[PDB]
């Protein structure tokens with residue numbers, strides 16, 4: 001891995017500053033855990049996480065969600081979880097009074113009834129629904145996510161966002177405004193990000209040129225940037241994905257006090273890896 005000296009990783013898609021012509025055990029739960037820890041910890045910093053109800057659609061099996069709840073439960077943050085998925089969740093989520101497990105595929109009608117029974121409490125939406133997928137599959141997925149936003153009207157959302165490939169384009173579509181969070185420990189050449197929105201909802205048109213820009217920017221990220229060693233980075237592992245993970249974890253709150261920030265991130269990574277059974 002070619003060496004590089006960085007002050008900070010790319011945290012959002014907009015920060016990628018070059019492009020290129022496209023050509024771990026249970027790593028997926030780790031990718032979801034960090035992005036959702038990052039998203040929810042940003043909301044905790046804004047003081048809007050407390051008292052909220054996190055509605056997670058497409059949450060199964062959702063092994064990592066147990067670590068998320070235990071983290072905010074041990075911080076004293078009052079959170080209710082509603083995990084909704086047609087598939088059965090990981091049994092490790094059983095027996096938690098603040099975690100409601102719902103075995104159901106959501107449609108427009110069911111989103112209405114969710115909103116009725118949760119209103120007027122604050123809703124935070126996490127969607128990871130997925131139906132290899134075609135462009136029509138993504139367009140239906142992203143349409144369903146817009147429907148989630150228009151109905152549930154969350155105070156904030158994290159949405160699965162991968163642009164359709166330019167060579168499989170069908171039509172222009174619309175997605176919410178927000179910041180497109182980059183995912184460490186994503187698959188080696190995944191172009192998937194998490195759209196993070198805080199609502200104070202204006203839609204954005206997504207064009208075939210944007211698909212080209214996503215494809216080239218994410219390929220440069222996956223081929224060049226993520227295969228670097230950050231030699232100035234004071235950490236036991238200096239591979240970029242660990243550098244990237246480090247900057248996400250420093251936004252995470254802890255009841256325990258540490259002599260240094262590096263000691264905190266090391267503890268958090270140890271805890272996350274140990275729960276996810278990663279060496």
Ligand SMILES: Nc1ncnc2c1c(C#Cc1cccc3ccccc13)cn2[C@@H]1O[C@H](CSCC[C@H](N)C(=O)O)[C@@H](O)[C@H]1O
Nearest residue numbers: 058059060061062085086087105106128129130140141144
């Ligand atoms: N509507 C839904 N409601 C609930 N869950 C759903 C869906 C859904 C759909 C869909 C349709 C989209 C558009 C149009 C349609 C028209 C007709 C029918 C369906 C759709 C997928 N899922 C679940 O997403 C998971 C993906 S991997 C997450 C992994 C997880 N994040 C983890 O932590 O492991 C997987 O378990 C699925 O069962």
